[PDB]
């Protein structure tokens, strides 16, 4: 079964409900509210595409190597991913992304931390 997810900027993504369901909130909307175009006003297309990619890879579910490479994005995209994971309530995504930022903090001085994150 599949549903359409609509980003804040209007891109429509046809998604397997088995993939979409890792978002606890979308899961309830699709299964219970039965929402045709599931609107997601706070996630843009670029980030939604990445969230869907992650969900697609993790649909069958230390940072796994695949996630480390997936998260090798710029800092801004990483923070947007954290936000989107939070917004959509995708725990696994939230975890790996927060872990990734945590690793940028480990073994560094407060001074080095200020620098990398501004």
């Amino acid at each position: 079964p599949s549903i359409k997810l609509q980003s804040s900027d209007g891109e429509i993504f046809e998604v397997d409900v088995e993939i979409a369901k890792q978002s606890v909130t979308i899961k309830t909307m699709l299964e219970d509210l039965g929402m045709d175009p599931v609107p997601l006003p706070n996630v843009n297309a670029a980030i939604l595409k990445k969230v869907i990619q992650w969900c697609t890879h993790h649909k069958d579910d230390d940072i796994p190597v695949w996630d480390q490479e997936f998260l090798k994005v710029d800092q801004g995209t990483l923070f947007e991913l954290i936000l989107a994971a939070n917004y959509l309530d995708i725990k696994g995504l939230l975890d790996v992304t927060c872990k990734t930022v945590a690793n940028m903090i480990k073994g560094k001085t407060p001074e080095e931390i200020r620098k990398t994150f501004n």
Partner: protein, 41 residues
């Protein structure tokens, strides 16, 4: 970080082994407050 809600910062800090929080606390105003979060100790 201009936008992550404090609850999300705690999520990041929760991944650090305790001694590590000393580093976080020495970064800035917010970090020092959250590093002292009941939920971490």
């Amino acid at each position: 970080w201009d936008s992550l809600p404090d609850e999300l910062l705690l999520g990041i800090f929760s991944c650090l082994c305790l001694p590590e929080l000393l580093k976080v606390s020495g970064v800035c105003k917010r970090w020092y407050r959250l590093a002292s979060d009941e939920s971490l100790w």
